[PDB]
Amino acid sequence: GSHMRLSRFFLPILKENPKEAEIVSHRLMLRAGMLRQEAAGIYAWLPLGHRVLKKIEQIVREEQNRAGAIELLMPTLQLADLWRESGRYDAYGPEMLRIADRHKRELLYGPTNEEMITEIFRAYIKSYKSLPLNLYHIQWKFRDEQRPRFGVMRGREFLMKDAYSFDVDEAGARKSYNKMFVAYLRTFARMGLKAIPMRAETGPIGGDLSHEFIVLAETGESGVYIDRDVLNLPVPDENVDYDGDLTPIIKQWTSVYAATEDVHEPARYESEVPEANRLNTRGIEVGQIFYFGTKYSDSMKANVTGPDGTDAPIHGGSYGVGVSRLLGAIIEACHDDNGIIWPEAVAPFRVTILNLKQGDAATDAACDQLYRELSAKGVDVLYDDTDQRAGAKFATADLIGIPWQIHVGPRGLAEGKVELKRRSDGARENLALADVVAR
Amino acid sequence: GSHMRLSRFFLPILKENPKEAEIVSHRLMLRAGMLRQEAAGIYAWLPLGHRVLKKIEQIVREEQNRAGAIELLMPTLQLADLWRESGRYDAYGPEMLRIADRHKRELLYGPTNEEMITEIFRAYIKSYKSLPLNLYHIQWKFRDEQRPRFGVMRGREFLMKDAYSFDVDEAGARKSYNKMFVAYLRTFARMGLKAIPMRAETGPIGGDLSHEFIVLAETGESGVYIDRDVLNLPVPDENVDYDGDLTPIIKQWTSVYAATEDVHEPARYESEVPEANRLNTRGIEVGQIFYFGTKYSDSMKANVTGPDGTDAPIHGGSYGVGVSRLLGAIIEACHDDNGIIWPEAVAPFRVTILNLKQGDAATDAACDQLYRELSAKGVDVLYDDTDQRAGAKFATADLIGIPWQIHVGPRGLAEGKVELKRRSDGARENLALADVVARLT
């Protein structure tokens, strides 16, 4: 169980709202000592911020692994000549950061990895017997966004989990897509979010294999239109049979209307949804699933021999979760006027011990014992042991969004008690000291 | 307890030695399906290779944290104007990868982070009361090596843990340095390595606060000169008191001659090292610790108010561990004619189950139940459930370096027996099917 004394940590709280922050998540990430801008759209993750980033990453990896995807890692830099194979090199646009090395070879900072994962696959896989195959990584990307804005939510250097599926045909690809559909429901639910799968912009094919998972938010950059029954639907549990038929889960989550502004058609919204169920708002895109078929396998000649002995190009899909963007989206969805309210699964620490009389022998000893006992038992524990008054300590503890606070003072200890406070709702309970660790 | 079936994994084994690989680590990482070259010196980490990389990373993290260092993350792209503050922008050389963004703003892919970490520090810290402070990250770096070579050992895009200490004065900085020296001894020992601390190149004003930690290996690029006695010294255990005097540990590890070629002096060597103890050999630099004083805090104005109430520049030090390079160094030190021999702490899996008659109802069933039981007991386990002959499975298991093998076949099972083989020495053991989990757990 991770453990830190605030005095041996690095957590620079800002007293004042930063004028450069336009939205609440950006404001709070800066105020709560989580983030520092290094260039437009390019950030250092300060210790508290990095802890959350890592919690998010691990939840994503866990669900990808559950769904059968296999983790690897591609480099940040890629050869232009690879992108020339697919014809994306000259068609991608100015968001692609192009680089020349000392030998004048043409490189780029990868904005995504379709060509590269296809290059890897086609080196090693030649039989339909290796498929379905889903390979993924969690890696830093760069898109040279014209106007970086909104802190971690519209920047340039961002962290993404990007997964790529390989199948013999469209039928198998739909099964691979369904696996990721289910994994994403579970991923965002585990973060305390209702990220709704919404039908999204398709490619030149058309079809129905394009969804964006969007958390409803009014500072959000995506316009959306939904049927409110979608917000009530049940998320599959951890025993979901990923080798089985997933269609019933998908049917459930798509049986009721949900579309982004790209594929939204005002006349359909009415023939399906009751007027009292209809809602038109805005949101943050945190996940994207997309079938692309033979887009890369045709141009890059990524073929496998089929059950019938003929070679044919594979069918692929891509699945992205914006891991660094999620820090912003989560704060947008989970805060109040006193600061952040971390869902437990993503919080940097689960409990903070607040010593209300720093230097008094009895309160110090009590906090020292709690801190030691909580860590011994696997609990992520922050000990606020700074030379600050109680009210100073409450405000910082509230701001940074730690799920639980333990208040320790001379007053409470005279009676053998400490106060336990829940951040989400302000529940408070004056407990015996010997009971508090049995949570 | 991590678990995988080979049929559900991605592990591209190469039959032949790749002609582009000049050294054993490079050859084996390609053969064992751990690595793919994407450009000169730039690699993708295939699933097996990535697993080992992450094991290495976590041991490094654990020892930094134990020593009181605090993890953050800096971005890979940095502003040229930051490097103009310190004067290093134009001094660094052609190994720096310069980049222009769409607005013609001047960026670079960070080769290191002294300027950036000092910039973060100076924004927030103003009192001597905040010190000592050591901030670190584990992040991808770029050095445009003129001639990338030797796979992960002399590439361009690489993973480093880099830490940076901040202190009021040189005395405090020496205490910060000692803590990292001890952390490094523990770090490399936990990976099954003897990464020897040796005196290394100092800066302008010289001194005694530069060391490199070097794994001896025939194919290494560092030339070193040591008293062989340094090879048998004791590594501090996990209960080392990082807030105490570490001077006795440092003294012991610096009591015999050990120097890289950059600072080696023949006269001193001959004088301090008995002839039969002298060893001049090659090695791989895996750790580097270096006190730089006020080099960045002078130019970048990172002062704090000290005990005397006056403001003065801080004293800093940098500490780098070559995380990706360590896969190469580990294999160089840990292999035989049949492939890799992973130390258990960095192995991608601890045990592999070799089904020697794939499709046989009883061998499948016994393998399936060993696989489930080992997972449950928290063991990193791989089950080679592929449709391949015994010889093929034996060759692949030896190659990829899994510490233990369980060989499960008709002939063994007739006796209710399985064979447990230890990769390191090839020691074999026939033992009951029930007793086998209990021996490994």
UniProtKB/Swiss-Prot annotation, chain A:
GO terms for molecular function: ATP binding; proline-tRNA ligase activity. PROSITE patterns: AA_TRNA_LIGASE_II. Disulfide bonds: none annotated. One of its GO terms (cellular component) is cytosol. Coiled coil: none annotated. CDD domains: ProRS_anticodon_short, ProRS_core_prok. Its EC number is 6.1.1.15. It is an enzyme of class 6 (ligase). It catalyses: tRNA(Pro) + L-proline + ATP = L-prolyl-tRNA(Pro) + AMP + diphosphate. It is found in: Cytoplasm. Keywords: Aminoacyl-tRNA synthetase, ATP-binding, Cytoplasm, Ligase, Nucleotide-binding, Protein biosynthesis. Pfam families: HGTP_anticodon, tRNA-synt_2b. Its main location: cytoplasm. Belongs to the class-II aminoacyl-tRNA synthetase family. ProS type 2 subfamily. NCBIfam families: PRK12325.1, proS_fam_II. Catalyzes the attachment of proline to tRNA(Pro) in a two-step reaction: proline is first activated by ATP to form Pro-AMP and then transferred to the acceptor end of tRNA(Pro). Can inadvertently accommodate and process cysteine. The misacylated Cys-tRNA(Pro) is not edited by ProRS. Homodimer. This is Proline--tRNA ligase. It comes from Rhodopseudomonas palustris (strain ATCC BAA-98 / CGA009). The gene is proS.
